[PDB]
Write a protein that binds this DNA or RNA. Structure first.
Ligand SMILES: [Mn+2]
Ligand SMILES: [Mn+2]
Lengths: 240, 240
DNA sequence: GCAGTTTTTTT
DNA sequence: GCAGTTTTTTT
């Protein structure tokens, strides 16, 4: 499956090199298809390969629209590589094949929206930090969640990235870089004396040694980098 | 191409036999896909085979919605027969392949909506007539135009079917049965003394010997069967 | 894994 | 042919 994921990243990056820019309107430049924003209710997107139409839901937030669009573009890239398609047919089936294809298109979509070049630029400017996470979401015009998964994958040291927001600050989303085994489950509570909540209240960014507030009550030592945004904090728990 | 058209009729009829009925909501019963009616602006329909979604425009008239739906269903039937698909790949290309596929799906769609059984039932009850045309559109829940093309194809004698409506009664749509070479171009004018206009004005159906009012001014003898509806007349010009 | 959205894990 | 929608043909 990782082979397929690699090949999907290849196609998507080749696609995104050919694009003039990553603005929402330049993304469809390398595809013989038309794009229509309209109200789609619950559905976020659709790609009709036979009539060459991409439909994106106009009622959802821009960052979602952008990820759905790159998802749908990756659907096209996949239908165009009969080799990758052939391998998947010889390796999966039925419902399993469906999930594999959907995951690959999510992979390809992040590969279009967030080039390794941008992630490494921020990594060198800001380190594997809450600040880098915040900057990635803004500079790539993606949601904090998509940026977190992308930033974490490219982080070569032990770090547990998280997105927190009142819901009562709680972990809304989180991922660890390749080596990490620990998991900060969504809804894990943020103590009010913890720098992440201090960041949100003070509205200032905080770098300092603190702890991961796992639900088990284990306070695992970590160095926290928290960047406060509007009712949300993007944080990096660096582990030793 | 006719081979492909035949094979498309095979799949569609096999599909429609399995259906409980031809009501708009039973048509999607034999397909692992979901159907969503929503406002689609200019577009009439879309089929996403990867997410298994059929989208039909809610703003267009029911008869159109019904034809678009059977069109989209025929798209699915085609993606499922790799043999028919293979032949088309070995026979057409690029834009030509696109039109071929679209025509076949229109073929399959009429085959779903209008079974030979229904057409022959009306042919035996009403003859190759304007009345048969009218009854076909109502009993199949299709537009007069789609019924005309279907009825004409199954008419074994020389007849030029037409749909006329004020636009000034003019030929809005027309087709001739297999043998006919003449063409009653859309916009051909209906003289006000001609029984078709008499039918519309009297609101009574007329069977009588008359003539085809070709634009060339040639009044070719024909036996007319005209059934008056709401601001429209479905007529059969039987030729010798 | 896969999430794509505001020694510290835990079917 | 392909339209799928209210001797009489005519790039
Ligand atoms: Mn998808
Ligand atoms: Mn089509």
């Amino acid at each position: 499956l990782a082979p397929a994921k690699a090949r999907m990243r290849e196609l998507a990056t080749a696609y995104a090199r050919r694009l003039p820019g990553l603005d929402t309107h330049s993304l469809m430049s390398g595809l013989d298809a038309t794009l229509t924003f309209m109200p789609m209710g619950d559905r976020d997107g659709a790609y009709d390969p036979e009539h060459r139409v991409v439909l994106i839901n106009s009622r959802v937030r821009p960052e979602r629209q952008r990820f759905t669009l790159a998802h749908e573009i990756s659907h096209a890239l996949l239908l165009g590589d009969d080799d990758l398609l052939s391998d998947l047919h010889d390796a999966y089936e039925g419902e399993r094949l469906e999930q594999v294809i959907e995951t690959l298109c999510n992979v390809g979509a992040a590969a279009i929206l967030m080039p390794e070049t941008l992630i490494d630029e921020l990594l060198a400017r800001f380190g594997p930090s809450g600040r880098a996470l915040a900057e990635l979401a803004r500079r790539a015009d993606v949601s904090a969640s998509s940026a977190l998964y992308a930033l974490a994958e490219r982080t070569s040291v032990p770090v547990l990235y998280a997105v927190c927001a009142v819901s009562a600050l709680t972990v809304r989303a989180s991922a660890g870089s390749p080596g990490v085994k620990y998991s900060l489950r969504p809804g894990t509570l943020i103590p009010d004396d913890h720098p992440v909540a201090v960041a949100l209240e003070t509205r200032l960014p905080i770098t300092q040694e603190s702890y991961v507030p796992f639900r088990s009550g284990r306070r695992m030592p970590a160095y926290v980098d928290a960047f406060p945004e509007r009712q949300r904090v993007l944080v990096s728990f660096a582990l030793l």
